[PDB]
Amino acid sequence: TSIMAVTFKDGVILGADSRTTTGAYIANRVTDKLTRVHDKIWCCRSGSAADTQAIADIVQYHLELYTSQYGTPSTETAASVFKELCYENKDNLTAGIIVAGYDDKNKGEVYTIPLGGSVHKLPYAIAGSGSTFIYGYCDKNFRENMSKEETVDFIKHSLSQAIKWDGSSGGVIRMVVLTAAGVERLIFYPDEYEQL
Amino acid sequence: MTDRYSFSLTTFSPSGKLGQIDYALTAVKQGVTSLGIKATNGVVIATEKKSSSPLAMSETLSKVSLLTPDIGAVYSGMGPDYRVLVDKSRKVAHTSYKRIYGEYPPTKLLVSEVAKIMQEATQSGGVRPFGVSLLIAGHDEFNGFSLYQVDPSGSYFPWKATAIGKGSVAAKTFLEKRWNDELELEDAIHIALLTLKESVEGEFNGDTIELAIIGDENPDLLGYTGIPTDKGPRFRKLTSQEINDRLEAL
Amino acid sequence: NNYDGDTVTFSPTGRLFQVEYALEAIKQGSVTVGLRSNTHAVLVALKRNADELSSYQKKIIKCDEHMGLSLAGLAPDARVLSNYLRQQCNYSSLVFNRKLAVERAGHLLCDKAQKNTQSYGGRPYGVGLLIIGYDKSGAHLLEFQPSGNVTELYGTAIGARSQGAKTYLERTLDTFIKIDGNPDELIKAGVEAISQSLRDESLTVDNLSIAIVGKDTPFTIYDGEAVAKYI
Amino acid sequence: TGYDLSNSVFSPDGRNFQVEYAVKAVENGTTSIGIKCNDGVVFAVEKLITSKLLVPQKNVKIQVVDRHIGCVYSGLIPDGRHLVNRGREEAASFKKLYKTPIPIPAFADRLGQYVQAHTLYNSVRPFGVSTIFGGVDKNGAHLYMLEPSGSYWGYKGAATGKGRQSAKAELEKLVDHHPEGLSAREAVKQAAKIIYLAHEDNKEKDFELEISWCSLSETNGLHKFVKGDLLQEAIDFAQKEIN
Amino acid sequence: GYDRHITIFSPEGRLYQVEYAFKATNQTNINSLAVRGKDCTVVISQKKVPDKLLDPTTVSYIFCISRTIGMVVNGPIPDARNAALRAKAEAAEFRYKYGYDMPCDVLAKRMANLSQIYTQRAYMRPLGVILTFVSVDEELGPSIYKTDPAGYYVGYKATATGPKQQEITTNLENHFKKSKIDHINEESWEKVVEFAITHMIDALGTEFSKNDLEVGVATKDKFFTLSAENIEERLVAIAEQ
Amino acid sequence: GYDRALSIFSPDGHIFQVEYALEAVKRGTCAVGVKGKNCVVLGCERRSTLKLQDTRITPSKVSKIDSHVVLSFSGLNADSRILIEKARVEAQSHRLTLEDPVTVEYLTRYVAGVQQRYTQSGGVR
Amino acid sequence: GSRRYDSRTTIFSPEGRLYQVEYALESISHAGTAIGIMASDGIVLAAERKVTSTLLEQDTSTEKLYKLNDKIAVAVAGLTADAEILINTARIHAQNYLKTYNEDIPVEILVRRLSDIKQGYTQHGGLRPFGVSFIYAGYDDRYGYQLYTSNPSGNYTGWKAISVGANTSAAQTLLQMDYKDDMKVDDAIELALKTLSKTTDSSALTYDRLEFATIRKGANDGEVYQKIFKPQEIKDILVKTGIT
Amino acid sequence: TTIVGVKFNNGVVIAADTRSTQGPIVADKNCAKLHRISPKIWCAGAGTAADTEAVTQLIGSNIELHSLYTSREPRVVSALQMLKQHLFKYQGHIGAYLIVAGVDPTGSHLFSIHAHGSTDVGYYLSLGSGSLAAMAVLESHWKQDLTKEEAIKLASDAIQAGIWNDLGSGSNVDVCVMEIGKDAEYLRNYLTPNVREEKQKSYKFPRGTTAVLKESIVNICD
Amino acid sequence: SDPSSINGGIVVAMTGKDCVAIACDLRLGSQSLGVSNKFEKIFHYGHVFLGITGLATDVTTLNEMFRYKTNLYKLKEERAIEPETFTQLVSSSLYERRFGPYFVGPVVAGINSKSGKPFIAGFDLIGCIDEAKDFIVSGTASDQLFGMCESLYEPNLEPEDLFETISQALLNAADRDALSGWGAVVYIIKKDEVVKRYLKMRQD
Ligand SMILES: *[C@@H](CS(C)(=O)=O)[C@H](Cc1ccc(CN)cc1)NC(=O)CNC(=O)[C@H](CC(C)C)NC(=O)[C@H](Cc1ccccc1)N=[N+]=[N-]
Ligand SMILES: [Cl-]
């Protein structure tokens, strides 16, 4: 799995591959690892599919109930709920989650939650097995306050390399753009990204 | 805090009466008339749809309820008490029977389980009895067609035909004259409509009357094909149009 | 009348009668006095006996090295509440290595008494307490009532004929507050204060009970021949 | 009848008499007020000096919840403390799960539901306090008042206790004369005046004034007590207005 | 006569506590109304703010239960909020357990069943409220379903609640006799709100300013309440016709 | 659980429920015990309003608690079965832990303790 | 609190009686009469249905007589719903004993346990007692044929012949007159029907208002058979004894 | 086991083989692996057979009760959510691997569920020991906008790939078609390409061949 | 220490023309030691027959449990349980102990009294139903029984002929398994008569 979230001028963009493996067999080549926990708060899931899926459902439930009572939650609030589940059930979970969202006050925000259940707020984040191969690339090429088109290229090029080297990663590159304008879904096929 | 009512709210009086059960029966007497008739090849259950307001959609309120594919129920008395009983009855049919034997319970045993629930509200701590009488019609392979009445006490009796609620005394007399052991299902539907016209006062049409049958299997209502043994539900609720057709040749 | 069967019921004028009846048990109890300076805090208690063959009911209880109370009313209820205070003082020491503030001691007693006044089945505590102590903000004196109400004071008294001692302390306020660095003189003022609540009986050797806490003095109780100095 | 002997029983009117009886205990208590201002809230309370033997400044009645919410109440003081203890638990679990400090409207409903729950069963007694509370959150300033029934609303100004009608009248004048808004430092001075004016309904024993405040500019969004020079300045302002 | 204090039967088969809970419904002295359009469902309610010291924005008897469901209450605010919080929790749990948004009529049934339990179990009192649920359901279309302290519930072509409920009811009955249809034959929700306010003015016989009303609108995929200025714009349109 | 304090004191210092239980004993059929030099005899009345009885199968008035101890009673018959059962169980439990049958004094002390517990336990008569 | 509304079902009167037990017995005295007669070679159970309607389904009905196992049956008098709770408990207890010991439960042991349940409702829990009286008819290899009865107090006794429900005073006098120890089953059948026919509140005793059952050793060699009589079989036995 | 699901124009189709095994031994040569959750929601199961059957029956019961409570036809996502939350609770100890498919008021749906509680969405899916043989056929011949008759052919071809090439799978092909607006049609033994040939000899023994010690009439009657 | 093969044993069931047959061995041992030669593994509840192989304590326990449950069924339903229904009861009861199971291999056999149709079924330890037209096998020589049945069986055999086929299937399978044998019993079941025969087999 290769996943990343990147903040930019107008908001934040989430990105991921589409490969799910049971050993060396590809169980699903068109997986959607970008999942909605609220209108403009999404997450990227890595680790056990069952655990991240169960966790994301519980978080979506908690935030739906939060919104009914207290109005739209912050991205920080969503990350805190993810953390509370991951930290208090660390002994029985294998989940690496990146939380990303758009407020109008706070603009784009990215929180990463590794295995332990610790929370880390960052300008951009990478995770999953394929992320190891792009630490060097992403560090050298990331800039703050990028444009939408610049950020899409950054994610596309980054995940393209993660896919190239990681056997556990592949298929299509899905992306989700979070801005004031709304929510946009993007897809990029092998014939495009492989020859970058 | 906490439920401090751990004691019975239904007790014996010096005369040997159980007050709350008698008073529950009084509530049933006030309720709208409903009836049931057993034929040779089916069973019919019927009642009036008393509308609370003309702005209210009476289609959304269902007095005649499916319990299993071959068992239906109707009531007289307090509607909310009935609604929760139907929920509990549907659930007990699964938990105490279908999840064990892989088939739906026969009429007599489902009736028995409903009766048990009603009896416990007569003896358990901090609760009043249910304010309803049920009429349960159904079919099963080894007992054939059957019709049962269940009271607030938990007592139940099988009937060839009967009525409960507002005008039950007059309705039972009408049914005694018309009932024989050679009645076909269409004949029993005809008699059910005649009996119910006596107790209804206002409009008498398919929109104010609620009627269902336990008859032949309905393959068209099953939802699927391919399994020969599965032939469809014997319970069918008659439509508004299907009632009005039989009211012309009345 | 019809609204005193239990503590869960309010009267039409907004009164809790069971709580008021518990307050009555304190008035029947023997007199006890509390007063403090800036350096020390003193409890003086008149003990009561069943007859000449009996002992005198012990009124003062120690809660920690720096805190303790005197009681008036149902003694078993004072045992329950003083035991709770001992635990809370102790929890503060073990967990936080911190001597429990006298103000927080009062807040904890208040909240414990309240829960008994809002639930069916239970009953209010039938005792009033005078808590003295020396902590990080100097000397302290508290008055607890089983309604829940806790009050910090320079001096006070509770029990039968407590109004006599309470008036005396209200006159003497300016004098005894400035008895700093002198234990014996602060006790003398407390013994003279409780004397204003006496009728027919006088203070004898096995009748009087005194307790003191202060800057360089742990909470200690004096009985028997040790109080003969102050008669 | 007998409909007023048990809590949670409806009378033939549709009323819970036990709750109305709890309101009487509230009316018996000392006066307390709340004033909403430009960027925050101010709270004030009347403390009756029963005796010379009471230590001045050392019987504090206003209580803080979390770091940003102030609470004051009139009636049974222990019942008020119990309600604040719950409020502190509710605010703690919110912050634990959702990170952000509890919003004031969110906090208002947590107390509301808890107080309402004590009107549902005969095994519990209704709360003998009306509670004025509020603070500053992400959406600005909020002032609330909660009653024994569980009923609460937002307020421009709020008052409860023995001198509630006097204080309400004085509060209504401030709303009319200042439509654009009242400042935080002004609201402290006005609060002092309104307690001194409301003391006329409880004038046997003389009293001690106690004020607290939350303001985005003056206290940086946190709850603080008014003490020292700013307290004495507000007392002098109140003394000048009565004469 | 302890059979009038708790929810047990009286000698004539009646639950007096339930009946007295119905009387608590009108304690606020507020009238509500609900109607259905082609694409929408509108609910309106009177707004009375007697105290000058109250913050009028926090005074409300309409609640947003879920994104699609709205609820208006007739009864005291503590019980109203009690019912609202529970409904919000039930709707959220339904979505989590079954994977789709709880329908209006199903939530009504669930809240009605809860109300039924308080009429049978002794330790719990009934809530003194009537809950009117509104939505545009994805299967049944525009929907109005109403609950009471007895545990009764039913769907409605239109409905009204409050002290002057009967006057509003017959006003609406007479309109549907004339129009010969089950709903307001109108395209935009704006004109369905105008219909609702117009027929409330005629039935109650009072005029309304912008602060005297409170409006909730349910469309496909969202329920929302109108602001003072949104209502004022709507009042101007009625006056100029 | 049902908690109600049914056995309570009255203004004159009597527990009426305990005293009314004594009236139930006074209603019951007579029973007598006489001990000799080398024996004990237990005599019991049986009311003669009941003819057409089957004396083979009808519960006998004297019950064996162990092979060496017996128990007769007066009062409510249904109540006596509960005491007899508990006594019989305690008899076998004593043999199991002490390796010796109960003394008559010990078995009595146990039964009497059970009777006492039902005079200050909530929810029971 | 809730003290106000507590009936206190498990207390003594000043006279030393249990209020609720006494009132439950008053209830049972209005229920349809049930008779049990024990013969040397079998047992008869007869019972009168409560005021029948002509449109009641008679053949597929069970009100009075219930089967507990293959060797034991009961006749009911009181609330049917209450009886069914106790019957299912008894049916279970019988199967627990069989599962544990691999032997059919002795009649007295089943009776004692069902009676001990009823006793509990009179001493603790604050609930109303069961408004039911049973006649137990059964066989085991220790005591042979046995008749018992239990009532809401939880007290049980054994009988040669007995009645419960309505008109027991009159019924018991008639049984006491004509019963003798060397009696056969066919004679006991006749006695049971003759007793009901005289004590009935109805005008005439007919097949449609009766439930009937026998427990004989009339099977093939040293084994017990339970016969719950069909409508037509009751019609024939009523003609054969000359009542109709 | 070999099981497939394929989406088409106006609905969805699932299919399965009919072999049941204990280790290398064939226990049942013609079991039905296509279970019914609801009338128009069908479930195909692989893994531990008791678990797939037990879990499918439990959720199908709770779905029926939910359908009656809500007065609505049950949705596939409800079965999916209830299954996956049950399986997740048991941490994979219930070894059920399912393909869930059906039509409802929302439309036509196709999902897969794994023992640990994870789920997937797809136009074509396959589970079981013959999933790789089947998925190879699906990846070669699947296209967008399939007709009903094309999808049945593709599905049964994918099952055949399992039957011939996977040892865990064999015997016949079951199919269930779920089209929108129509009743679902279950096609038990849609193909029977593995008929047993005529035996070379009859092994009917002469009567009296078996030696007997004791005879006795058994009593089944009362 | 493998529960299913400590005690040893086998069961087999077959269908015929308007009839069914069910048969079992008699051995009970403790691994190599043979202990009892009278341990029957086939029980009946009315007209429904149940054979159980596996751990003998659980065989006894389940018989006692199904006797209990079918007795209560008959009291409440006022009729004897049928094979199709009993099969579902077994499955339910076994799956109830999913994570602490009875180490058994049960086999149901009988004729439906209403339709007259011959019925057989088999289960794993955990409850999974295995329905079959032809035959069901169970026990320590299950492999052997599968091979004998698959070759010897033909459809629509008369009762007298079916007896020979099932007896020969069991005997020759049992002789190739060390933990099975020591005697055998065969039940032939027609609509309203049941014959039980004890077979002569080698005693090693
Ligand atoms: C194929 C699955 S596979 C080989 O993993 O691809 C089929 C699927 C299937 C068959 C039949 C049905 C009908 N309900 C549904 C789905 N599964 C199997 O072949 C799996 N077979 C089994 O589980 C056996 C079924 C018996 C009836 C023969 N049982 C066993 O193998 C048990 C399993 C088990 C044992 C102990 C603890 C847990 C499980 N083995 N044993 N003893
Ligand atoms: Cl519900």
Short mmCIF file of N, CA and C in Angstrom, two decimals, chain H residues 175-204:
data_model
loop_
_atom_site.label_atom_id
_atom_site.label_comp_id
_atom_site.label_asym_id
_atom_site.label_seq_id
_atom_site.Cartn_x
_atom_site.Cartn_y
_atom_site.Cartn_z
N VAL H 175 -26.28 -21.83 -10.38
CA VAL H 175 -26.35 -20.41 -10.75
C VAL H 175 -27.59 -19.78 -10.11
N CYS H 176 -27.47 -18.51 -9.72
CA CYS H 176 -28.61 -17.71 -9.28
C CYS H 176 -28.55 -16.32 -9.93
N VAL H 177 -29.59 -15.98 -10.68
CA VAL H 177 -29.67 -14.70 -11.39
C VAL H 177 -30.60 -13.77 -10.63
N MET H 178 -30.14 -12.56 -10.36
CA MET H 178 -30.92 -11.54 -9.67
C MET H 178 -30.99 -10.32 -10.58
N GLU H 179 -32.11 -10.19 -11.28
CA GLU H 179 -32.37 -9.06 -12.18
C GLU H 179 -33.27 -8.05 -11.47
N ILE H 180 -33.12 -6.77 -11.81
CA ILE H 180 -33.94 -5.69 -11.24
C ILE H 180 -35.36 -5.76 -11.80
N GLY H 181 -36.35 -5.63 -10.92
CA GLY H 181 -37.76 -5.67 -11.31
C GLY H 181 -38.38 -7.05 -11.50
N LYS H 182 -37.56 -8.11 -11.45
CA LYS H 182 -38.01 -9.49 -11.65
C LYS H 182 -37.71 -10.31 -10.39
N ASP H 183 -38.33 -11.49 -10.31
CA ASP H 183 -38.00 -12.46 -9.26
C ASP H 183 -36.62 -13.04 -9.55
N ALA H 184 -35.88 -13.37 -8.50
CA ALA H 184 -34.59 -14.03 -8.65
C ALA H 184 -34.82 -15.48 -9.04
N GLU H 185 -34.11 -15.98 -10.06
CA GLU H 185 -34.24 -17.39 -10.46
C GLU H 185 -33.01 -18.23 -10.09
N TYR H 186 -33.22 -19.18 -9.18
CA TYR H 186 -32.20 -20.13 -8.73
C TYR H 186 -32.17 -21.31 -9.70
N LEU H 187 -31.02 -21.53 -10.33
CA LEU H 187 -30.85 -22.61 -11.31
C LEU H 187 -29.98 -23.74 -10.77
N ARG H 188 -30.58 -24.56 -9.90
CA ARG H 188 -29.90 -25.72 -9.28
C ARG H 188 -29.47 -26.70 -10.37
N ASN H 189 -28.20 -27.10 -10.33
CA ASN H 189 -27.59 -27.98 -11.34
C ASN H 189 -27.86 -27.48 -12.77
N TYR H 190 -27.48 -26.22 -13.00
CA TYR H 190 -27.58 -25.57 -14.32
C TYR H 190 -26.77 -26.30 -15.39
N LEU H 191 -25.61 -26.82 -14.99
CA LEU H 191 -24.80 -27.70 -15.83
C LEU H 191 -24.42 -28.94 -15.04
N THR H 192 -24.48 -30.10 -15.70
CA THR H 192 -24.09 -31.37 -15.09
C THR H 192 -23.13 -32.11 -16.03
N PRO H 193 -21.88 -31.60 -16.15
CA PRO H 193 -20.88 -32.19 -17.05
C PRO H 193 -20.05 -33.37 -16.49
N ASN H 194 -20.38 -33.84 -15.28
CA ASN H 194 -19.60 -34.87 -14.59
C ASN H 194 -20.53 -36.02 -14.15
N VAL H 195 -21.19 -36.64 -15.12
CA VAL H 195 -22.06 -37.79 -14.86
C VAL H 195 -21.19 -39.06 -14.77
N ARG H 196 -21.52 -39.91 -13.79
CA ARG H 196 -20.80 -41.17 -13.54
C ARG H 196 -21.18 -42.15 -14.64
N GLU H 197 -20.18 -42.78 -15.25
CA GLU H 197 -20.41 -43.75 -16.32
C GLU H 197 -21.02 -45.05 -15.78
N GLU H 198 -21.71 -45.80 -16.65
CA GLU H 198 -22.25 -47.12 -16.30
C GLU H 198 -21.14 -48.00 -15.73
N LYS H 199 -21.42 -48.66 -14.61
CA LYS H 199 -20.48 -49.61 -14.02
C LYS H 199 -20.37 -50.86 -14.89
N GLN H 200 -19.21 -51.51 -14.83
CA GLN H 200 -18.94 -52.71 -15.63
C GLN H 200 -19.69 -53.95 -15.14
N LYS H 201 -20.11 -53.95 -13.87
CA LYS H 201 -20.68 -55.13 -13.21
C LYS H 201 -21.65 -54.72 -12.10
N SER H 202 -22.69 -55.54 -11.90
CA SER H 202 -23.63 -55.35 -10.79
C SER H 202 -23.11 -56.12 -9.58
N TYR H 203 -23.05 -55.47 -8.42
CA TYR H 203 -22.59 -56.10 -7.17
C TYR H 203 -23.76 -56.45 -6.22
N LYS H 204 -24.90 -56.80 -6.80
CA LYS H 204 -26.04 -57.34 -6.07
C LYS H 204 -25.69 -58.76 -5.63
#
